[PDB]
Amino acid sequence: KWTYFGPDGENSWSKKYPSCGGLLQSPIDLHSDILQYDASLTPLEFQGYNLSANKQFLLTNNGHSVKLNLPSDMHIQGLQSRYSATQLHLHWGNPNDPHGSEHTVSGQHFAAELHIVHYNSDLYPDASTASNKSEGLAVLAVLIEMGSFNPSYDKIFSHLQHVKYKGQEAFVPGFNIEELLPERTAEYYRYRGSLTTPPCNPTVLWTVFRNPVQISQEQLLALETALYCTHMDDPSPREMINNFRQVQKFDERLVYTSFSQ
Amino acid sequence: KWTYFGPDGENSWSKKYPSCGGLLQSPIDLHSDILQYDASLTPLEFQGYNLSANKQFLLTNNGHSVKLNLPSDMHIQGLQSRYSATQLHLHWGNPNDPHGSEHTVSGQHFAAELHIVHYNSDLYPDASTASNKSEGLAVLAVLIEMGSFNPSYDKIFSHLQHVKYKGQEAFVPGFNIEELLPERTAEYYRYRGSLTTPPCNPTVLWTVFRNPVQISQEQLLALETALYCTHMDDPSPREMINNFRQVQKFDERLVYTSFSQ
Ligand SMILES: NS(=O)(=O)c1ccc(C(=O)CSc2ncccn2)cc1Cl
Ligand SMILES: NS(=O)(=O)c1ccc(C(=O)CSc2ncccn2)cc1Cl
Ligand SMILES: [Zn+2]
Numbered sequence: 001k002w003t004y005f006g007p008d009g010e011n012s013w014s015k016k017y018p019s020c021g022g023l024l025q026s027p028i029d030l031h032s033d034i035l036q037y038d039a040s041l042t043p044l045e046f047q048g049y050n051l052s053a054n055k056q057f058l059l060t061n062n063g064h065s066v067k068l069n070l071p072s073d074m075h076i077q078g079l080q081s082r083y084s085a086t087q088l089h090l091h092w093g094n095p096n097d098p099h100g101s102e103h104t105v106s107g108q109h110f111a112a113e114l115h116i117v118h119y120n121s122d123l124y125p126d127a128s129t130a131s132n133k134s135e136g137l138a139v140l141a142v143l144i145e146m147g148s149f150n151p152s153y154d155k156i157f158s159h160l161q162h163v164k165y166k167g168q169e170a171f172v173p174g175f176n177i178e179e180l181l182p183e184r185t186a187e188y189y190r191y192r193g194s195l196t197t198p199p200c201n202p203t204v205l206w207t208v209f210r211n212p213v214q215i216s217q218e219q220l221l222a223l224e225t226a227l228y229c230t231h232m233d234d235p236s237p238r239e240m241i242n243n244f245r246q247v248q249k250f251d252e253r254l255v256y257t258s259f260s261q
Numbered sequence: 262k263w264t265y266f267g268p269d270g271e272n273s274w275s276k277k278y279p280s281c282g283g284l285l286q287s288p289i290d291l292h293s294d295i296l297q298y299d300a301s302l303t304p305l306e307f308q309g310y311n312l313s314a315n316k317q318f319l320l321t322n323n324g325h326s327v328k329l330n331l332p333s334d335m336h337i338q339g340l341q342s343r344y345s346a347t348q349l350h351l352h353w354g355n356p357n358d359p360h361g362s363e364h365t366v367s368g369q370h371f372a373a374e375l376h377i378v379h380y381n382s383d384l385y386p387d388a389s390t391a392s393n394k395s396e397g398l399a400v401l402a403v404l405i406e407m408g409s410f411n412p413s414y415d416k417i418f419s420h421l422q423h424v425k426y427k428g429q430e431a432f433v434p435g436f437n438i439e440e441l442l443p444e445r446t447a448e449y450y451r452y453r454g455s456l457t458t459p460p461c462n463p464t465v466l467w468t469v470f471r472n473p474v475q476i477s478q479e480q481l482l483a484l485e486t487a488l489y490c491t492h493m494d495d496p497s498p499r500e501m502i503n504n505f506r507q508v509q510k511f512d513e514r515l516v517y518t519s520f521s522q
């Protein structure tokens with residue numbers, strides 16, 4: 001029942017979820033004083049991302065974001081264990097303030113952010129089990145800016161009116177998830193952090209790509225107006241808007257970059 | 262006991278201090294989309310700021326900042342009530358990331374920030390009693406950046422070595438506190454917010470001057486390195502660094518400015 005707004009908003013999540021008040025919290029502001037190039041951050045490879053258009057994948061409103069379940073044969077190659085996909089979801093702002101990324105760069109929000117959540121399948125049976133274990137999760141984050149219409153993100157957004165309320169589910173035909181990543185995926189920021197939602201487990205290896213992708217103003221408006229945190233029949237509806245956490249203190253951490261300049 | 266780092270850091274303040282998770286929280290990012298010129302915002306008058314050079318004022322390290330006590334005949338004229346001074350103090354970062362103001366401007370931190378705390382003396386007998394009451398407090402905030410040596414800030418900084426550890430004290434001879442204000446004090450941001458420290462009561466009328474002041478690199482490194490949060494005998498000393506709160510969400514609200522151009 002945590003939220004992003006009001007009594008149950010983010011400054012109160014530590015009252016029920018202790019790790020939200022603990023170390024290694026995400027998101028953070030990516031700024032020069034804390035960046036250091038690391039030549040050992042070699043390119044990731046995205047395997048099994050081209051999902052069959054003849055198969056379908058479950059989209060669900062979970063009361064906090066919209067998530068698409070992903071198959072465990074989809075994985076990242078190039079980390080020190082195989083990380084297999086489990087779901088992707090987004091964070092965004094609202095129609096009058098389309099500035100709802102979680103990570104910021106030199107103090108600036110992007111319009112929205114996509115997280116593709118993977119868990120260490122070499123060591124764990126599922127993401128749920130991985131989530132409270134050492135380097136159990138790895139997230140790929142894409143910063144999203146207002147720009148051109150994006151047909152690939154639209155393969156998710158064209159289903160939003162069928163998942164408006166908490167608990168609703170819809171099926172999305174498979175498409176190539178790598179089309180949601182930006183240009184030059186070899187350039188990224190890497191750091192050790194946490195889930196950005198309760199229970200804020202400090203068990204995530206973050207990769208934030210350097211380059212944003214664009215979606216249009218109309219696609220942002222659809223995402224910002226389609227969805228509710230609450231059930232269909234709730235007499236106290238709450239719009240799913242501004243579902244991003246503020247940046248966190250970077251208390252002694254560095255962020256490592258695969259690009260020098 | 263509340264701190265800015267570790268288990269007792271800002272995400273954890275709302276357990277004991279519930280207003281830290283309530284409405285009207287400060288600090289905030291001051292960015293162009295939420296600014297609105299208000300011609301009602303006339304210049305404040307700083308009355309009794311030229312402190313008798315024949316009086317001494319108590320400087321303390323209270324384990325959270327360095328604070329200078331101020332006399333109640335020093336006040337602001339121009340508000341709906343008279344607001345009398347009680348104390349000033351500062352917030353800063355650390356030498357590896359020397360960007361520790363509390364307010365930001367277009368997403369950017371300044372090096373440090375000075376707050377001159379005043380209370381509504383027309384309504385209340387002292388700042389403690391006013392702190393949790395309607396219209397209780399008014400703070401002037403000066404943004405600080407690195408540049409020229411500043412003799413006036415040195416009137417406080419030259420006593421830092423005497424207040425290294427928590428509980429220590431020193432006496433500062435009176436000087437003209439208006440020298441700590443920037444140029445063109447007619448130009449400011451104004452909004453209703455809260456204490457940025459526990460108990461975070463939403464009872465502060467903020468005035469953040471538009472223009473920063475400068476201190477030298479050596480004065481800024483002194484402020485960042487001079488003080489500890491802990492008592493002198495504490496076998497586990499903690500440096501007093503990064504003593505600023507992260508910015509808070511601020512949606513469907515305006516910050517009024519005395520300047521348009
Ligand atoms: N916003 S984010 O940080 O990318 C994030 C959001 C939700 C989840 C999960 O729910 C993973 S499954 C789980 N996690 C904790 C406790 C039981 N199950 C994981 C991640 Cl990495
Ligand atoms: N950082 S800040 O927001 O300028 C701020 C910091 C501390 C104090 C006080 O200590 C006011 S006196 C007091 N406050 C709360 C409880 C008992 N006494 C007041 C303000 Cl406005
Ligand atoms: Zn996320």
Ligand SMILES: [Zn+2]
Pocket residue numbers: 350351352376457
């Ligand atoms: Zn302060």
